[PDB]
Subunit: 208 residues, 5 copies
């Protein structure tokens, strides 16, 4: 009968926080999905928005796996004990303020789930925020230092309901969210960095 | 035993990253907010900036010692202890802990952590300037531990969350009610227990 | 013996996380604020932003060394020492410590810690612009140690008040009075000793 | 049979973050190049600008080298494991806010690439920002403590589009960027500190009108 | 023969960051000199200024010394590896924001040079800032915990241009800077703390 302590100790002994856990020469498949919680500050003049979102991050490290028939199937682990993908929002203009305890969930099969609530300010299109059509703010998120052969990022294919966890008390409302995959290259070099482009279509609530 | 020995033993047997479940039962965390001040309120953005003592209580029996011929209680830095990963679900700033980050550990293994916190929330501020006042609901629960691992309960002390509130604030508290809740997410089957603190307050005067 | 030996010995025998109670008696902490500046005052919100030296004095006999043929006093980083967990009960910001975080330790084990602090409080600012001025009450005591473990006493040596106060502030100090108190909470039986500092101040250069 | 694990372990064992990796007694050649991403806040009165830029930093540390015949030729490494040039913007008036994960890329030969996205406020000439000619804000960046014999700084010859990665959503636009080398000495002492002077010619966007 | 690595290793082994490096029982001679780079914000009413300056700090630690006939005569060292004087600006109302890499320069003889660029806000006389004569803002800087017998502070009097490194783009200009030695004592106690008093004579540009 394994206990939570044994599970953590095993993770510590095999997990290498600064070493990407590539199997063979294949990329690590990171799933990335934003659930928007609040839109706090919007500036149509500067084209800047301040947003709060849960950044659901999923990937696999099979070296962490254990046998969970007669033991817990999942444990909470501080991210300092784990390798974590070096995700960056490419159009952010502030560092991400992580609001929640920095713990990830590891499952007996080796799936890791890290989902911090983040508050961050972005440069994006705020034109039309006070119209019926609303504004569309595009947020690009991907690895900062790992190219397509080392990390691939994919939008999760979950749920669908956009305003599901969104504050009813915000001054804004969400019309639609669409998450699509992209791939930026830099003229310096031949490698491609995969990203997810989250399109946030929102507008001021108005009237009453 | 000397207080040094007690602390050394706590260090050596405490596991800050390991939830101290007895058997297969959840850890019973008691959570109670005592509001001290309301600093900033915005009826338009529905945001409040509040200061509150977050009284947090739970058991870790591995910490226990024999306190017949020794002190029954010590102050311990939380970095030496497992601490529940509580989050305010509708907070829009990180909690600014104002006070020394020490908890109190009793010889039986009861822990009491009560930081003074300043934090900004998204909640209903409509009616803050009326007789009825506004009702701001703050939900607080574990971020990563579900109902089988952590349960949160509003302390059986159902006394005044007032009585500690600044007389010098521009606002007044009408009522505070602390209730248990249990949220689930459509992705998954697990439930996260929370306490929902309903703060009914209003601006002082006309 | 030299300053290096003194520090090494302090490290070996000092226990920063162990309150140095002699017998079962409380540690007698002396607490005294010298106000240096009043920066910002708000009659509407009842908030003040102040800078003050928080003179803190206590005894830790475990620190003691000889000092016939060695220095009688050293500057020691507070991380090497037990330090009382003082908190201002009506503060609304964390104390911003402006000065190097060193205490002074004497060979007998007397400790003097005196950081310059900038901190914001919730207190009575009514009447700040009158002849009588406002009286802002600041309560400071241990956060986790009750009356049997820590006692706090005002050292009121003496009543000079404006002695170190900035001549360049827009406010002036009329009087400071430091008195002892003892708060209890209805949940629980323990009493927490505090010092209540009454700051009587007013805007300079009034009409009457 | 760990591979990237072995690489990192070996870097830890032989890397000295506090030791400048001079080959012989020659200076370390640090290449420094800004790509401007955003201009956030501009004040013609105070002569202050708030800018976001990628600071492409390149140098050689042969102590990091490994043999990559039967292993990966490149890894991402946290900068705390590496010596990193002590670059400062001389006319900055805020600390650099690093926005991106603090990882550098190390190649098996010991070439290092560190490229943080930085947000920082500067004191520079903002006069004329609202004219056709725009303002020219000069940002000076060099080692803080290493003189010309220990660190040399060279502007890369990217020589490309200036507005290439610049936000279309900024209120400002870039007219031209020119990166040139300089070399300042102080009256106290005989040593010279090499820097790069980045001249940002920008202006408020026109009209939107018709 | 010996290399930068050896030099640093030796510094680590023999340096004691928390131990003042007094030779015999004589004070450590700290030289302190401000070069003003910018004046960012001034408030005539509150008597507050926000300034940026290089704080050139010089002292001797002979325990650090090495050979250097067949090796480098100087190295850059992180200050966390060194003892550093606990200097404080006595009339500061913000903590010093250090803008530059926190490295000092150590010479083979044991001379240390630490020169951080600092941005800090002070309480000083801003009266007359908008006149031809300008204001004179006095900044006092000295040890916080080490008295005259342990640390002495002396102005480097390098007879130079004051506005040499000062921003041409500031709204203010410097008329004169004068650095003189002083010595504060407190009524509680007999010990004297040596300081340097930096007198910044400056004024708003233009408007005439
Ligand atoms: C793959 C594997 O071995 N899984 C095991 C199973 O065989 C065993 O019944 C149980 C008790 O050890 O733990 C699990
Ligand atoms: C040039 C060099 O040093 N590279 C070596 C290579 O010669 C050798 O075949 C291989 C296996 O040990 O390791 C690597
Ligand atoms: C510890 O406590 C138990 C429980 O009452 C008691 O029986 C035992 O004698 C104690 N042991 C000592 C003296 O440490
Ligand atoms: C300390 O100093 C006293 C001074 O007289 C001396 O008697 C003693 O032997 C010294 N050594 C100890 C025990 O600290
Ligand atoms: C430094 O080392 C060299 C070794 O070649 C020696 O000749 C020299 O005298 C040394 N310096 C001193 C003064 O010890
Ligand atoms: C709060 N939301 C949640 N799932 N969801 O929204 O789909 N799971 C809890 C996460 C488990 C690990 O970090 C938090
Ligand atoms: C964003 N630009 C990029 N390359 N470039 O511009 O030439 N690479 C990402 C960097 C690779 C190493 O650190 C981050
Ligand atoms: C100051 N308040 C106090 N009790 N109370 O408020 O009910 N006790 C100290 C707290 C309990 C242990 O951590 C801090
Ligand atoms: C800026 N001034 C400078 N020299 N000077 O002023 O004479 N050197 C850089 C310093 C070298 C040691 O720490 C920083
Ligand atoms: C500045 N004021 C002072 N005494 N006083 O004001 O009564 N002592 C310096 C202290 C020595 C230990 O920490 C600072």
């Amino acid at each position: 009968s394994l206990d939570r302590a044994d599970i953590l100790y095993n993770i510590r002994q095999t997990s290498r926080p600064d070493v990407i856990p590539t199997q063979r020469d294949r990329p690590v498949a990171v799933s990335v999905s934003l659930k928007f919680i609040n839109i706090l500050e919007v500036n149509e003049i500067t084209n800047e928005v301040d947003v709060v979102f849960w950044q659901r991050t999923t990937w696999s490290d099979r070296t962490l796996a254990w046998n969970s028939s007669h033991s817990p199937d999942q444990v909470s682990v501080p991210i300092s004990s784990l390798w974590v993908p070096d995700l960056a929002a490419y159009n952010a203009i502030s560092k991400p303020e992580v609001l929640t305890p920095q713990l990830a969930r590891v499952v007996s099969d080796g799936e890791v789930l890290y989902m911090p609530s983040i508050r961050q300010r972005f440069s994006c299109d705020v034109s039309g925020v006070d119209t019926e059509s609303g504004a569309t703010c595009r947020i690009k998120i991907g690895s900062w230092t790992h190219h397509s052969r080392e990390i691939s990022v994919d939008p999760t294919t979950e749920n669908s309901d956009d305003s599901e966890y969104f504050s009813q008390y915000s001054r804004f409302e969400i019309l639609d969210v669409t998450q699509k995959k992209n791939s930026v290259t830099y003229s310096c070099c031949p490698e491609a960095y995969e990203d997810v482009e989250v399109s946030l279509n929102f507008r001021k609530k108005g009237r009453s």
